[PDB]
Amino acid sequence: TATSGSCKGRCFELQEVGPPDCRCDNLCKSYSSCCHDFDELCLKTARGWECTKDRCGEVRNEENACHCSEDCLSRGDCCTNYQVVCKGESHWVDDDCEEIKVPECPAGFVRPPLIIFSVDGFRASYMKKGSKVMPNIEKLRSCGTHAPYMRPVYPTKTFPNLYTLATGLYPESHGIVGNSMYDPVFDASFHLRGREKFNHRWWGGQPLWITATKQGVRAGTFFWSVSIPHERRILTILQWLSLPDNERPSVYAFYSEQPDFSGHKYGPFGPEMTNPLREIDKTVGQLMDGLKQLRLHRCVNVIFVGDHGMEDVTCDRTEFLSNYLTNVDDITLVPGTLGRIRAKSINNSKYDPKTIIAALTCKKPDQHFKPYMKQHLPKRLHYANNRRIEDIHLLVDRRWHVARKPLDVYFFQGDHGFDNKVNSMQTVFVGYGPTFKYRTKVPPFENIELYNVMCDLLGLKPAPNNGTHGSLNHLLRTNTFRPTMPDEVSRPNYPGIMYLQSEFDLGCTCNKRLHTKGSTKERHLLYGRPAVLYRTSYDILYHTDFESGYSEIFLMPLWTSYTISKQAEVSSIPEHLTNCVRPDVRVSPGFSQNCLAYKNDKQMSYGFLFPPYLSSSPEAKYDAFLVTNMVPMYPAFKRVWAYFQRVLVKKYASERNGVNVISGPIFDYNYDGLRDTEDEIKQYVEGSSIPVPTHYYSIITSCLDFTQPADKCDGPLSVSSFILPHRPDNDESCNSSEDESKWVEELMKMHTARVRDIEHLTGLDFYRKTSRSYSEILTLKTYLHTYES
Numbered sequence: 001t002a003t004s005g006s007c008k009g010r011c012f013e014l015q016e017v018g019p020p021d022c023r024c025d026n027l028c029k030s031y032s033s034c035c036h037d038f039d040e041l042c043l044k045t046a047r048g049w050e051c052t053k054d055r056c057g058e059v060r061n062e063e064n065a066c067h068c069s070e071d072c073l074s075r076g077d078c079c080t081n082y083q084v085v086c087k088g089e090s091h092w093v094d095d096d097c098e099e100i101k102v103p104e105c106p107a108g109f110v111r112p113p114l115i116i117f118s119v120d121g122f123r124a125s126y127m128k129k130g131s132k133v134m135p136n137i138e139k140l141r142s143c144g145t146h147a148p149y150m151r152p153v154y155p156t157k158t159f160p161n162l163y164t165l166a167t168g169l170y171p172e173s174h175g176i177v178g179n180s181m182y183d184p185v186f187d188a189s190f191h192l193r194g195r196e197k198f199n200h201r202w203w204g205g206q207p208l209w210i211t212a213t214k215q216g217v218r219a220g221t222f223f224w225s226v227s228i229p230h231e232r233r234i235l236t237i238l239q240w241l242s243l244p245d246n247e248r249p250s251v252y253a254f255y256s257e258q259p260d261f262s263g264h265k266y267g268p269f270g271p272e273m274t275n276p277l278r279e280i281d282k283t284v285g286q287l288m289d290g291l292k293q294l295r296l297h298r299c300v301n302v303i304f305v306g307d308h309g310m311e312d313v314t315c316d317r318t319e320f321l322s323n324y325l326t327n328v329d330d331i332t333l334v335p336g337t338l339g340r341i342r343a344k345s346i347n348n349s350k351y352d353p354k355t356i357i358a359a360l361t362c363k364k365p366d367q368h369f370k371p372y373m374k375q376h377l378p379k380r381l382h383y384a385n386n387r388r389i390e391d392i393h394l395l396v397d398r399r400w401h402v403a404r405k406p407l408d409v410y411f412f413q414g415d416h417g418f419d420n421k422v423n424s425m426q427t428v429f430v431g432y433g434p435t436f437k438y439r440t441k442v443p444p445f446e447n448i449e450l451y452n453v454m455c456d457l458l459g460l461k462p463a464p465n466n467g468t469h470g471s472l473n474h475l476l477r478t479n480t481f482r483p484t485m486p487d488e489v490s491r492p493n494y495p496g497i498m499y500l501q502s503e504f505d506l507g508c509t510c511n512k513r514l515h516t517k518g519s520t521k522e523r524h525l526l527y528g529r530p531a532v533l534y535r536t537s538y539d540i541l542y543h544t545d546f547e548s549g550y551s552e553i554f555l556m557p558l559w560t561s562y563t564i565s566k567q568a569e570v571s572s573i574p575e576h577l578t579n580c581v582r583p584d585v586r587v588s589p590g591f592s593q594n595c596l597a598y599k600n601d602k603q604m605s606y607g608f609l610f611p612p613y614l615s616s617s618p619e620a621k622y623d624a625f626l627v628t629n630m631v632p633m634y635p636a637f638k639r640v641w642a643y644f645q646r647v648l649v650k651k652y653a654s655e656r657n658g659v660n661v662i663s664g665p666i667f668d669y670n671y672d673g674l675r676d677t678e679d680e681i682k683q684y685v686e687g688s689s690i691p692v693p694t695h696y697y698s699i700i701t702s703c704l705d706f707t708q709p710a711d712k713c714d715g716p717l718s719v720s721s722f723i724l725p726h727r728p729d730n731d732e733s734c735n736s737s738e739d740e741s742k743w744v745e746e747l748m749k750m751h752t753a754r755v756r757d758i759e760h761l762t763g764l765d766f767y768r769k770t771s772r773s774y775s776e777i778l779t780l781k782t783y784l785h786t787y788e789s
């Protein structure tokens, strides 16, 4: 570039220029392309950041970092404390909270601006634990809308989380799957240090600044160069807010590398952390004071958000793969608070993923990581459908690291990156301004949801993303998004009695009419039938104790719904009943399973969706053993499922005052988080067309007010759900030799899920017929029961 050009009149210009011009935008530094005089003109520091009484009314000196002259407000370049020191005004933090019912903006503003104030490593518990030293942040939190915590995405690192904030996408979809990555298609490596990360090919989706710009709404920079001091970042935003109407952005971002930087050195709660928290709070105060001087403090919506939390982690708490693998030199590891393994050489024909997994599985009693093939990771992590994610993954216990060899580890006392349900990884959310609610607490929610909300705040249509638009309506005073329930694509058949017993050849070892036309359906289907959102052929089957949507294409239920009261009795299941699976006279032989395929398949057995253990009556129990209630299950998985059905369902009914359960299969052989089509299924029961699920789900709903039984609930609902992997072993559960009471519940907690996760995986839409607002239901569908204290 012709660096001999000048930044005079151009400092922090919003639109980058190309060669031969030199640049004065904030990215110039990152591209070594700033005009020669950029530091001199654009990064002024003279006299620091604060007006003093002696400077009030000064003649303007262009060398100063900020101004205390009479003309500074119209120029938009006063120091943030100018009006306090020189005009007897109060600091924003010292003013009482006053509800902001409507935007109170200068003429020419067409919408309230949005400022995203992002703090790296701001762990959720800082809001309480640091309260005495963060009065500005505490005022935003108490006066605005806040959650107790916000859940990050996995991995709980900066780049994946900030880019999720910007796009509404899971890392597997936006592509920023770690702070370090290898892309095999491009044969390229992304690192925190170096130039490859600047290549646009890494950054997928459509970030908020693009969404805005394409829709005619101007944006400030999102990236801030490390060397631009925070006070200059703030002053820059405030100068941009003073631009003419057709030049001024509507969306802005601030980023702070604190408290993360100090948290890595000192741990999350090291005594050294107080000062960083005070410093960040000071910066918030600068911004708020600056807005108040500009008459924008009741105009702009401020989002105070972190990217992830921070855990205690030390060099000694490192597991070494060289203690497990004889062949450690044949692998490449992406190390730390997660592990990702691939072959060092793609020409090495002796590398074998299975052997690596086996050598890493339950080898030391206290082992502080667990290996997975990525498709076997908990589905809630949504961490598999990208070629940048290695097939072999190590989920590392909180407080630990993994490394390849001890020499890699020859400082830090804090780190992050762990599973996003871990409490130490949670972060913060506050929204303050005219469009957010006043003095309102909202439940915890996921950061994937925020893109849609920022688009709502800006009048933008969001690009397609992984939020559930409307699930955060309860944060907002205005600009809610009101969607319609998706249209049902396939209508059910309602078959009657159409086949005689002797038409079947199952190969098994061997008022009723009111219940078959759906007379207890009100009790067992409490929220309406699920809607099927794709083209298929299915049947609704009614029974005294349960209702099902039976797929003629997959030869099993898509869903099975049943209600269990607090007083339900559990009964024995003798094996002669399990062996004598009965034809369903409503469903053709051709569209049914059989016992022979199971007898022939030495690896596959079967279970039942409605639990025979919880049958209400003799008439009713026969229904539990219908061929249309059977599902393929490996013997190892039947241990898990039997415990859930025999012990856990009744325990949850007792605790919750009844539960409604919807269970069913999931097929996701391509690990994309989406329902498989029939032609994607990789495994059948031997000699048959009976497809093998990759997972089994259950959605367990009750009354939020547990004084009301689940079947007579007048108000909001409570849900917990799971997506259990259908595996042929229990190798994931290192204590699985013990009784199920010692390991199954732990496995289930790990595989906790949102209803929305199940919806993606099944093409079903739940909760169609409740008494509740649709936005309330969408929030319910995004809920995750995390099992953390």
Ligand SMILES: *[C@@H]1O[C@H](CO)[C@@H](O[C@@H]2O[C@H](CO)[C@@H](O[C@@H]3O[C@H](CO[C@H]4O[C@H](CO)[C@@H](O)[C@H](O[C@H]5O[C@H](CO)[C@@H](O)[C@H](O)[C@@H]5O[C@H]5O[C@H](CO)[C@@H](O)[C@H](O)[C@@H]5O)[C@@H]4O)[C@@H](O)[C@H](O[C@H]4O[C@H](CO)[C@@H](O)[C@H](O)[C@@H]4O[C@H]4O[C@H](CO)[C@@H](O)[C@H](O)[C@@H]4O)[C@@H]3O)[C@H](O)[C@H]2NC(C)=O)[C@H](O)[C@H]1NC(C)=O
Residues within 6 Å of the ligand: 169, 170, 172, 173, 174, 175, 201, 202, 203, 204, 205, 382, 385, 386, 387, 464, 465, 466, 672, 673, 674, 760
């Ligand atoms: C979370 O939300 C996101 C956003 O809604 C959901 O992701 C979408 O899911 C769709 C289904 O998986 C997917 O749709 C496919 O789009 C293809 C066009 O894709 C390009 O163009 C779009 C639009 O501008 C762009 O967004 C895409 O961006 C991806 O790829 C670039 C690299 O080019 C990456 O930088 C970027 O990060 C992003 O990667 C992510 O998605 C790709 C898949 O697109 C993954 O490979 C990555 O790992 C990463 O996850 C692209 O630039 C389109 O071509 C597809 O159509 C084919 O396949 C379907 C199969 O059902 C079929 O109907 C079509 O006929 C067609 O078939 C032909 O191609 C097949 C595949 O090669 C072939 O085998 C057949 O024989 C046929 O010839 C399909 O429509 C959409 O791209 C993504 N969007 C994003 C941003 O990720 C996501 O599902 C949500 N998650 C959950 C769990 O709900």
Ligand SMILES: Cc1cc(COc2n[nH]c3c2CCN(C(=O)c2ccc(S(N)(=O)=O)cc2)CC3)c(C(C)(C)C)cc1Cl
Residues within 6 Å of the ligand: 116, 118, 120, 121, 157, 158, 159, 162, 163, 165, 166, 179, 192, 222, 223, 224, 225, 226, 253, 254, 255, 257, 260
């Ligand atoms: C609001 C918002 C802001 C930004 C800008 O964010 C940044 N501006 N400037 C820096 C950043 C972050 C990275 N970075 C780091 O120093 C860093 C720090 C810790 C870790 S670690 N180790 O804690 O994970 C890893 C990297 C360099 C400085 C973005 C984008 C997407 C543009 C990044 C999106 C949004 Cl929505």
Ligand SMILES: Cc1cc(COc2n[nH]c3c2CCN(C(=O)c2ccc(S(N)(=O)=O)cc2)CC3)c(C(C)(C)C)cc1Cl
Residues within 6 Å of the ligand: 014, 015, 016, 027, 030, 163, 197, 198, 199, 200, 203, 207, 209, 213, 218, 219, 220, 221, 222, 223
């Ligand atoms: C895509 C991407 C690239 C890079 C490399 O660097 C950049 N190259 N090109 C841009 C960036 C930074 C991000 N970025 C902005 O912050 C921005 C700038 C101007 C306006 S504007 N023009 O609307 O005012 C709005 C937003 C868009 C442009 C990074 C890292 C983190 C590696 C820096 C992160 C990302 Cl997500």
Ligand SMILES: [Ca+2]
Residues within 6 Å of the ligand: 021
């Ligand atoms: Ca020029």
Ligand SMILES: [Ca+2]
Residues within 6 Å of the ligand: 667, 668, 669, 670, 671, 672, 673, 674, 675, 676, 677
């Ligand atoms: Ca799939």
Ligand SMILES: [Cl-]
Residues within 6 Å of the ligand: 155, 157, 177, 178, 179, 180, 334
């Ligand atoms: Cl990483």
Ligand SMILES: [K+]
Residues within 6 Å of the ligand: 598, 599, 600, 601, 602, 603, 604, 605
């Ligand atoms: K078998």
Ligand code: NA
Residues within 6 Å of the ligand: 730, 731, 732, 733, 734, 735, 736, 737
């Ligand atoms: Na085991």
Ligand SMILES: [Zn+2]
Residues within 6 Å of the ligand: 121, 158, 260, 261, 264, 416
């Ligand atoms: Zn960090």
